[PDB]
Every structure is written in C-alpha cells, then in structure tokens.
Amino acid sequence: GAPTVSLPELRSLLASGRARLFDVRSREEAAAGTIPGALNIPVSELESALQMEPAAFQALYSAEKPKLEDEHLVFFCQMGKRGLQATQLARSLGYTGARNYAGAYREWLEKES
Questions:
Q1: Lowest CB count within 10 Å: 17, 39, 46, 70, which one?
Q2: Cα radius of gyration rounded to whole Å, the chain
Q3: Which residues form a coiled coil?
C-alpha cells in the first residue's frame, strides 16, 4: 500500500481482482487507449469525483465510487506526473489506498508482451 506501485505488483493485483485502475489523463487521451480495465477520471475532475455523492459518481462514470477504506486504488497517466498529482489528491481526501503507478502508461506499453 505504499505511495508507488510497481508494474510486477500491479500485474498480480489485477490478476487477483485486488486493484482498481484510474486513468487520470484527459478523456481524449484515455479514449485512444488505456490500461485494460481502467476507469477514466481526468485529474481535473478527480476532486469533484471523490467529493460527489455515490449515485452522482455512478451516473457520471458508470462505475461505483471508491470507498475510503479501499486498497490498491491505482492512479496513472502516461509518464507519472498527473498520476502522482491524482494520488496525492486522493490521499489528501482520506483515500489511504491510493497509489501511483509511476512507470505509467508508456511503461505499460513498453513492457507489454
């Protein structure tokens, strides 16, 4: 649950059903391709997403709002910086399970088989 998650740990958390992914790039970036399973919440929307009521989150994002007690809420962008910003923001609002995939989408693409 440390502030950064590495790719090997992330791959095992995804295979076990224990991590949720959040692509914090813009909508036009995420629409062009993302890490499989990732929910797009652009970093500029993330504060409002974490503050809004659960039913409003479901309406806008078509997924269930995370809970403060969740583990392995993994944020990422393509090169680390927005993922870091998002992780810090989420932690600051009480999401102790927020972690940054610092290697980010470019590493994901680089290490994909």
A1: 17
A2: 13
A3: none
Helices (H) and strands (E) in the chain, counts: 6, 4
Candidates 47, 30, 59, 48; CA nearest to 87 is 47
Contact 54, 65 (CB under 8 A): yes
Method used to obtain the model:
X-ray
Q: Which residues are catalytic?
A: 77
Contact (Cβ atoms closer than 8 angstroms) between residue 21 and residue 76: yes
Element spanning 66, H or E: none
Q: Are 38 and 30 in contact (CB under 8 A)?
A: yes
Q: Return the structure tokens found at 96.
A: 């102790």
How far is residue 87's CA from residue 101's CA, in Å, rounded to a whole number? 9
Contacts of 40 (CB under 8 A, 6+ apart): 22, 23, 24, 25, 27, 30, 31, 34
Q: Provide the pairing of β-strand 39-40 with 20-23.
A: parallel
Token pair for 75: 């944020």
Q: Would you tell me how many other CB atoms lie within 10 Å of the CB of residue 49?
A: 18
